[PDB]
Design a protein around this ligand. Structure first.
Ligand code: Z80
Ligand code: Z80
Lengths: 156, 156
């Protein structure tokens, strides 16, 4: 991924978000409701020391679970790192802070991204920017959700 | 759907095709490998009387089945009709006859479409046209396949 935001004021991205759209390099990453990249954002929490913490929802066994994950900071302001079996990088491509924010999760050759929004509505404008950002990238599946699904656990 | 091809010479669309990309109004139509719209095109056969016949592949129980379906002709050259529990319309939006062909299956509020190609390669140009044609339409999932998957039963 070759697109980060400059002057990333991480403190300003805290609060409430909606995973409006999702996309992945491989069909099986967003494939079924249980698929590995199919993860729903509830909340972004930065820590005082500048780490970034996710609140998420996942369909796991027979239902919608809750989760926390903490992405530790780096030298480049917009790149974070999560400790799993892999080297998992999170990158903030772009955000205007108060409507939308775009980001990608990547490893290593797998890659997923998302268009986050503040309210339960279809920001047409946000979807463009998200589309522009991806045509640089080798994606093979995309999803987006309606306002009705946006107010449910795990998106219905 | 508000886009058909004019002067549709149905005889010229016979032979071999590859379901390069797919898209649907609802996530669950292309969702899992078993999903209702997830149907792979092997061959288009017109009949002498101008009916249009599909050869397809579907993942059904534990494997990739074969199928035939016959879409009967109408007054408008580019619209066909299949007899199921529903009124199922097929529409040919566009084809240059020798590289790509776009079409949509619709009922009634469900809708899926596809970009068909002649060989196992990514026609970048074909994907544009397909993208143009859909932004008129309320889609919420898209897929595309690589050349490797294109030579397998049911796309791997
Ligand atoms: C335990 N899980 C639910 C979380 C890892 C899922 N997840 C993910 C998915 C597909 C490919 C790469 C990644 S890294 C990542 C980075 C940030 C976030 Cl928010 C999610 C992910
Ligand atoms: C028995 N099945 C495998 C065939 C029906 C599936 N199929 C379909 C899917 C989702 C929504 C509407 C339709 S009508 C249709 C028209 C032409 C073709 Cl080629 C396929 C379909």
């Amino acid at each position: 991924v070759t697109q980060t935001m400059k002057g990333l004021d991480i403190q300003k991205v805290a609060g409430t978000w909606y995973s409006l759209a999702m996309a992945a390099s491989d069909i099986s990453l967003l494939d079924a409701q249980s698929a590995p990249a199919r993860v729903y954002v509830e909340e972004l929490k930065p820590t005082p020391e500048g780490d970034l913490e996710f609140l998420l929802q996942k369909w796991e066994n027979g239902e919608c679970a809750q989760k926390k994950i903490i992405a530790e900071k780096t030298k480049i302001p917009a790149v974070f790192k999560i400790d799993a079996l892999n080297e998992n990088k999170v990158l903030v491509l772009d955000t205007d802070y108060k409507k939308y924010l775009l980001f990608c999760m990547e490893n290593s050759q797998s890659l997923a991204c998302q268009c986050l929004v503040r309210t339960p509505e279809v920001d047409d404008e946000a979807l463009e920017k998200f589309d522009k950002a991806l045509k640089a990238l080798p994606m093979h599946i995309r999803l987006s959700f309606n306002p009705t699904q946006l107010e449910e656990q795990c998106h219905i």
